[PDB]
Amino acid sequence: PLSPPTNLHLEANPDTGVLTVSWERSTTPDITGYRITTTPTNGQQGNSLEEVVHADQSSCTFDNLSPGLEYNVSVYTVKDDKESVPISDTIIPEVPQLTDLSFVDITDSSIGLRWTPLNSSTIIGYRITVVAAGEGIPIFEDFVDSSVGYYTVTGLEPGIDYDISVITLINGGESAPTTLTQQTAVPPPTDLRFTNIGPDTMRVTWAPPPSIDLTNFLVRYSPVKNEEDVAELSISPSDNAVVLTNLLPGTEYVVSVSSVYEQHESTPLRGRQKTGLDSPTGIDFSDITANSFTVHWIAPRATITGYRIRHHPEHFSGRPREDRVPHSRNSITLTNLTPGTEYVVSIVALNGREESPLLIGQQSTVSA
Amino acid sequence: PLSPPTNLHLEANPDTGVLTVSWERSTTPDITGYRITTTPTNGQQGNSLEEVVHADQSSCTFDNLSPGLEYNVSVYTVKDDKESVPISDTIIPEVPQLTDLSFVDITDSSIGLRWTPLNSSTIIGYRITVVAAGEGIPIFEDFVDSSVGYYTVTGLEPGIDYDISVITLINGGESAPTTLTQQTAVPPPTDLRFTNIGPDTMRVTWAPPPSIDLTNFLVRYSPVKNEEDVAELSISPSDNAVVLTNLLPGTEYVVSVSSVYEQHESTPLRGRQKTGLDSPTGIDFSDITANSFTVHWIAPRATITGYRIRHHPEHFSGRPREDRVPHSRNSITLTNLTPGTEYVVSIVALNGREESPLLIGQQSTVSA
Numbered sequence: 001p002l003s004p005p006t007n008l009h010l011e012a013n014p015d016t017g018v019l020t021v022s023w024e025r026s027t028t029p030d031i032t033g034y035r036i037t038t039t040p041t042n043g044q045q046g047n048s049l050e051e052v053v054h055a056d057q058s059s060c061t062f063d064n065l066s067p068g069l070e071y072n073v074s075v076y077t078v079k080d081d082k083e084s085v086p087i088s089d090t091i092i093p094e095v096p097q098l099t100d101l102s103f104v105d106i107t108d109s110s111i112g113l114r115w116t117p118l119n120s121s122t123i124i125g126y127r128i129t130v131v132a133a134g135e136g137i138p139i140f141e142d143f144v145d146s147s148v149g150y151y152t153v154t155g156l157e158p159g160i161d162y163d164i165s166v167i168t169l170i171n172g173g174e175s176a177p178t179t180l181t182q183q184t185a186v187p188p189p190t191d192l193r194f195t196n197i198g199p200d201t202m203r204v205t206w207a208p209p210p211s212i213d214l215t216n217f218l219v220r221y222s223p224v225k226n227e228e229d230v231a232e233l234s235i236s237p238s239d240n241a242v243v244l245t246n247l248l249p250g251t252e253y254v255v256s257v258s259s260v261y262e263q264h265e266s267t268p269l270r271g272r273q274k275t276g277l278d279s280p281t282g283i284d285f286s287d288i289t290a291n292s293f294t295v296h297w298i299a300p301r302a303t304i305t306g307y308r309i310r311h312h313p314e315h316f317s318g319r320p321r322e323d324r325v326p327h328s329r330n331s332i333t334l335t336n337l338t339p340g341t342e343y344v345v346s347i348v349a350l351n352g353r354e355e356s357p358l359l360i361g362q363q364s365t366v367s368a
Numbered sequence: 369p370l371s372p373p374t375n376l377h378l379e380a381n382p383d384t385g386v387l388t389v390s391w392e393r394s395t396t397p398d399i400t401g402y403r404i405t406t407t408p409t410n411g412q413q414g415n416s417l418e419e420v421v422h423a424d425q426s427s428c429t430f431d432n433l434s435p436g437l438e439y440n441v442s443v444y445t446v447k448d449d450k451e452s453v454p455i456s457d458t459i460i461p462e463v464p465q466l467t468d469l470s471f472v473d474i475t476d477s478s479i480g481l482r483w484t485p486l487n488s489s490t491i492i493g494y495r496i497t498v499v500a501a502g503e504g505i506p507i508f509e510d511f512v513d514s515s516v517g518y519y520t521v522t523g524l525e526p527g528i529d530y531d532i533s534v535i536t537l538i539n540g541g542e543s544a545p546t547t548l549t550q551q552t553a554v555p556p557p558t559d560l561r562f563t564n565i566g567p568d569t570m571r572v573t574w575a576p577p578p579s580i581d582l583t584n585f586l587v588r589y590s591p592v593k594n595e596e597d598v599a600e601l602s603i604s605p606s607d608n609a610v611v612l613t614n615l616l617p618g619t620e621y622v623v624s625v626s627s628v629y630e631q632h633e634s635t636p637l638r639g640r641q642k643t644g645l646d647s648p649t650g651i652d653f654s655d656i657t658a659n660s661f662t663v664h665w666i667a668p669r670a671t672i673t674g675y676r677i678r679h680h681p682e683h684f685s686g687r688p689r690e691d692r693v694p695h696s697r698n699s700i701t702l703t704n705l706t707p708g709t710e711y712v713v714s715i716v717a718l719n720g721r722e723e724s725p726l727l728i729g730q731q732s733t734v735s736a
Contacts, residue, residue, distance in 0.1 A: 064686035211579035318432035
């Protein structure tokens with residue numbers, strides 16, 4: 001009676017797909033070797049594997065087991081013509097499962113999936129399950145190749161938690177699911193337009209996201225050359241425009257609109273808009289004669305290149321005379337005027353082709 | 369007593385800004401000439417113009433009247449030291465008004481404005497009025513320079529008629545408004561995604577426009593190489609996805625989704641998607657021996673570059689043997705097999721890295 005092996009140990013490595021079988025050697029003196037069988041437990045009748053090792057060996061490997069199947073492993077002491085009663089145990093090799101599922105590109109309707117594929121030749125694909133933990137059903141299942149580690153989930157609501165699982169697929173089997181939970185972001189406004197541009201004012205407009213139980217909108221603004229100074233307004237849920245007041249003339253402003261929901265805020269919709277030129281002020285006249293007078297004004301605050309001065313007799317605006325004056329000047333003498341005539345004089349600030357609103361005043365020449 | 373002129377005629381050309389004054393000459397024999405005054409009617413006290421012509425002349429021009437002001441024009445026969453009683457009439461020069469307002473770029477929220485500026489130096493700008501003829505107020509007024517003929521109106525609803533006017537602005541005055549009426553377009557779906565791609569099937573998804581009393585969605589599809597054959601489905605207002613069935617494998621399809629409202633249809637949201645490869649079919653075996661057998665299959669319909677054949681003993685899927693076969697072949701002999709062993713054989717069609725689903729079958733070698 002040959003003493004069987006003892007302390008059978010079965011280790012099925014899911015990373016390598018290799019089963020290591022190890023044992024404690026028999027206590028019988030002169031043995032030929034060991035015989036190791038691997039057989040699926042349903043019935044011995046089908047395919048089985050056999051490995052034979054020398055007497056000094058106390059381990060062997062089987063590299064081709066099916067993940068998910070149960071196997072009986074038996075080890076026999078061999079003495080030439082004879083064999084011990086075996087030592088047996090069962091093992092079920094794990095179906096490999098992704099351990100590095102990650103979320104990236106989280107928008108208000110989109111979630112990107114980030115995992116690293118498994119280079120095992122038993123793997124026919126991966127199932128992606130998306131369950132809305134809110135009130136939706138398991139709405140979304142999709143399938144993918146063995147050679148993908150990059151999937152994108154789209155068409156999601158902003159106010160919902162999603163359960164996202166990836167299941168490793170083999171032939172007639174699955175891994176346990178790897179699941180993660182995430183809310184999508186608060187949806188930002190879109191399409192930022194600036195209208196009604198004055199020297200001190202501008203109207204800001206945006207397209208709100210779909211139809212949401214929105215709390216309010218957040219509007220932030222600041223000069224480009226002075227990012228520090230930020231003002232902030234709370235805008236009504238149903239409004240999509242605010243008229244900004246009290247702004248500096250000829251100044252580029254940075255504006256951003258954020259949607260508010262569940263205390264969170266959306267990403268800023270951002271653009272830049274310059275205010276217009278302010279008008280010259282303080283028109284005045286001096287040294288009136290029958291055929292001439294001198295016109296004065298005060299520079300606007302904004303940076304200008306010069307002015308356009310127009311004049312014509314009051315009530316005859318049809319064909320005015322015109323002069324251009326650089327920004328370094330704030331007066332002009334108008335000549336070749338008609339005696340005893342009321343004149344209308346208008347001054348416009350220019351920055352290239354940018355124009356300020358008119359400064360208008362009236363002065364009469366004296367009688368000849 | 370000198371006979372005054374007769375049949376006074378006043379013509380104020382709005383295109384040129386010039387007033388032509390004409391008359392029938394006096395019936396008095398020896399006259400010096402004519403004297404023509406132009407005066408604003410409010411009171412003669414302010415500025416007025418005077419033109420003097422020779423005896424043979426029966427017309428004169430004034431090029432500097434103000435559009436919108438009423439003027440008295442008087443013509444006097446002159447005989448050296450003396451003058452006739454005048455012939456008088458009043459005229460109000462029209463404030464020029466745009467006659468070529470046009471609509472272009474009509475989307476579902478946007479209307480572009482197309483007019484040609486007026487090169488008159490009395491014109492300080494143009495007002496744009498946008499009244500929703502639906503239920504909205506005169507929500508939108510904006511202002512613009514004399515040198516613009518290109519404005520864009522944005523942020524509009526799909527189910528509304530808009531009244532859009534442009535008013536010519538002068539100093540202390542306006543033209544009559546030039547008005548046009550338009551509905552905006554039916555809003556299209558956005559963001560076309562294709563999921564669940566099979567050989568015969570694909571899932572089409574879109575983002576619907578805002579929140580609208582939508583009637584239904586229109587889905588059209590056709591192969592790229594056969595644009596003629598178009599199928600069409602009616603999709604529920606609340607659904608944003610349809611699973612297309614019965615498609616041809618390995619074939620690029622053109623798909624387009626249209627929103628339906630008030631019998632009109634939106635612009636198509638269009639993209640292209642290829643279906644996957646279909647599997648080989650009809651696996652079979654022949655000429656079985658102890659260490660080999662021949663495998664057969666039938667080509668899939670789609671265009672392929674070749675096949676991948678894998679085999680392994682049943683219940684030992686861990687480390688299968690592999691062969692590549694070009695598309696010109698539909699059989700392979702597998703050798704160096706084990707006797708009395710059930711084998712699992714799988715065939716996959718390949719087009720480069722594109723893979724079909726598996727065709728799987730089983731064959732046993734005979735006993736040695």
